[model samples]
Target: HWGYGKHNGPEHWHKDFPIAKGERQSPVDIDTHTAKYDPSLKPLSVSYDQATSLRILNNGHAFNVEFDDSQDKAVLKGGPLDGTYRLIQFHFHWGSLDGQGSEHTVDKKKYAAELHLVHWNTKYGDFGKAVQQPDGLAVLGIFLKVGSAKPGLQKVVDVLDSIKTKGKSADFTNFDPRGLLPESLDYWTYPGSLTTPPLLECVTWIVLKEPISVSSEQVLKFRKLNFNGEGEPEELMVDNWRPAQPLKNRQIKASFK
Candidate 1:
């Protein structure tokens, strides 16, 4: 719901899905001061061509895009990560009207918004079959800071008129959603779980240390995205961030290998 408030807000998301009580909940603030050791970590690579076939959806929590699995150029080639991991869906988490947002919390801090690039392990014969594997999914998190307004994000925002209400999403055409990513591909790596339900501990989380910037106006537009049916705009959903949580002695790792 766009206008999530009180009982309807994100904090209560786990109430309906008790499994969300996992220690791996995202939007966590990352602090370099508590850095630990995990030398064996290696980062994975994704090809833009393989990440196409994007389809956006509005599940009430927020908007997200689903990338088709047939995109072959995006498979893992070596290491303990060998296999074809099909890019799946991507969604965002944010604040109410004037705040930060992020999916993973590092040292109990939150950013403006968090973008998740979801992928499914293709080690099994097919995607549906791969769901049961431990390495069944991967999520790359891109953090957003409120600063310069981003034109890339406008691509999605430009279409807001189409899916202006909850459960009201439409299919877009000929758009390369990848353009929304920040210029820097550099990211902080980790072996973590999904921020959502099932809270499966199988995801490979690559959270970018650097964040993209957006302006107050753009942030306002983000808040303007409605939850109630068409024409019923509520309070802006700005700063819809969850307070950062403790890293719980976890060593955030990375991949460049």
Candidate 2:
């Protein structure tokens, strides 16, 4: 199976998923100083209704907060995106050690962790259909720092015990995703692919400038989670992040100066 292991890590992913070697691969290092500031960029507009959140699942990769995208219950517009992008799920990637987990970096500095809110362009009809197109997805990336414990994230951490093993899932609703975002909406935009397989070159990455706070203890809980099912030898679910990819000819556009 595809994973962050010695044999199945990102380095070997291209052997199976050819898109791993694609031009627009994700989780690139963001050189803030070199990024071009686009004055024409519009402020991000987002609305996430708590009721639309359905459940949380530990899919062996990471714990995902699934949403009911049947309707426009939660949507993101503006900020390098055209039309509306409906929220489908949100997940995270982190390492066992601090200061080195985030998929995207700023000025070559890695963060404690990273959060991804996955959305699909409504114009593409559905997520399954959208993921195959060039302009089909827009993922919001929020860097996580090791600082004071975030009260807003406690709701998510509390459910970790129930989903310690892969394939375990439970009801997780009424939790507003907005509570997890930083105060500032300023971000850097670029065209990139999903960090994982099939590594489709469809996402317009909107990575935030400011990082949200998370405690060391909380991050430790994430390490305790397993990547295997009940019968398999438990593999710790840490360092589940992809390394920075080549920038190629892509330009990083900042929303602020």
Candidate 3:
């Protein structure tokens, strides 16, 4: 399996998933000074229902909270999107230290962690099927900085103990994904791929400029997760982010100046 380790990490992912080497790869460094402000971009509109949040699972890659996307209970629209994108799951990427870990960096500075709320276009059949099309998916990225302990984030950390190993999952409901967002909806837009493989180029990245806050203590708890299952050599879940890829010919648009 493709794990974030020295042996089978992002550097070698291209051997198996060729799209990892694609031109529109994600986790790109956002040069804020150079990004063009586009007034045409609409304000982000999100409608997330707490009841649609189903459970949280440790999938070795990251801890994901899956949503019931059977209908348009929770959806993202208006920000660099053509139509509604249904919320499917949300996950995080972090590192061994507080200095670096976020998948996307701004002006070469990395945050303590990054949050990805994954969604699929309603026009597609499902997440799996949508990921193959050009505009089939949209991912909202929010950086996480170490600071005061966030009371709102406690709901997620509280369940970490039960899902410490790969394939472990537990029921989690009435958790609104909206609580996880930063105050400002300002963001940078680009065409990119999933940070992890099969590295499809279906994603339209909307990376928020402002970061949310977490605590030093809470950050350490994330490091306690394991990549292996029961009785296997445990691999600590840290530095699971892919290195920033080239911008190529892409034009990154900003919602605010």
Candidate 4:
């Protein structure tokens, strides 16, 4: 029932999940001038194995590529985090066009899209228990610019046609999440929440300052996916993004000057 539309879009999320209006909510407007450079934050580390990738699925909201987190084969550490966090799933959010898709804005500027690599703190035992703690999760946010095609992203785009509708899934293996990273790991971090429903305020958001590029044609393929499952009335799966939330009593930390 909760969808990004005139009826149940982000603006109405607070009615069902009161924490939507709470402190530390995510996707804040990253005012570069105000983002303080924090020396205490360490460099981020990522270790991902090719075999860790399991499958991909369209869950009506966004298409998610899940990993086999049974072991610490793939994980993210450091950069304002205490211990290692196992990679769980990765997903994307985009708009119908090239200019206004990214959830987090830099100096009020939007990107073409955004990618989120979700991880759960291993200290908390598992994802379910970890998600409830304040320091439970860490999500890497990378922006997508419209420019030359990214060969890394093309690997993901190739499989989109198989899971084009809601509830559809296919075996997606041998993909390394690192293939999608930009050259530099410089980042801005802050306390935040999940950008979607059940908008839990448990994430330590590490947003890469550098963005990767994608072709306009590649994004067009994303727009072709259906928000509705097969046989239902058709609705294109575009604008699957939440607006930047209020950043009350929060600090945005920068890893680079």
Query: What is the C-alpha local distance difference test score of candidate 1?
Result: 0.61
Please give the distance, in angstroms, between residue 117's alpha carbon in candidate 2 and its true position after superposition. 0.3
Top candidate when judged by lDDT against the true structure: 2
Task: Compose the digit string of candidate 2's lDDT tens values, residues 1-257.
Answer: 89999988889899889989889999999999899999999999988754378899999999999999998889999989889999999999999899789999999999989999999999988999999999999999999999899888989998999998899999997888988999999999999999998899999999999999999988988889999987799899999999999999899999998
RMSD of each: 3.5, 0.9, 0.9, 0.9
Please, what are the lDDT tens digits per residue for candidate 3 over residues 210-239? 999999988899999998886799889999
Model 3 residue runs over 4 Å out of place are none
Across 33-93, the per-residue lDDT of candidate 1 in tens digits comes to 6444345544446666544545566655577766666756444433225565666666788
TM-score of each: 0.80, 0.98, 0.98, 0.98
**Which consecutive 10 residues in model 1 have the weakest lDDT in total?**
73-82
Q: What C-alpha lDDT does candidate 2 achieve relative to the native structure?
A: 0.93
| Candidate 2 lowest-lDDT run of ten | 45-54
Report how far off residue 76 is in candidate 1 (Å).
Answer: 6.5
Model 1 Cα RMSD, Å? 3.5
**Alpha-carbon deviation at 179 in model 4, angstroms:** 1.0
Mind giving the per-residue lDDT tens digits that candidate 4 earns over 1-257?
Answer: 78999998888888999999999898899999999999888999988764378899999999999999888988899889999999999999998999889999999999989999999999999999998999999999999999999888887898999998999999998888888999999999999999998999999999999999999988988888899999999999999999988899988999998
- Model 4 residue runs over 4 Å out of place are none
Worst 10 residues of 3 by lDDT: 45-54
In order, the Cα lDDT scores of the candidates are: 0.61, 0.93, 0.92, 0.92
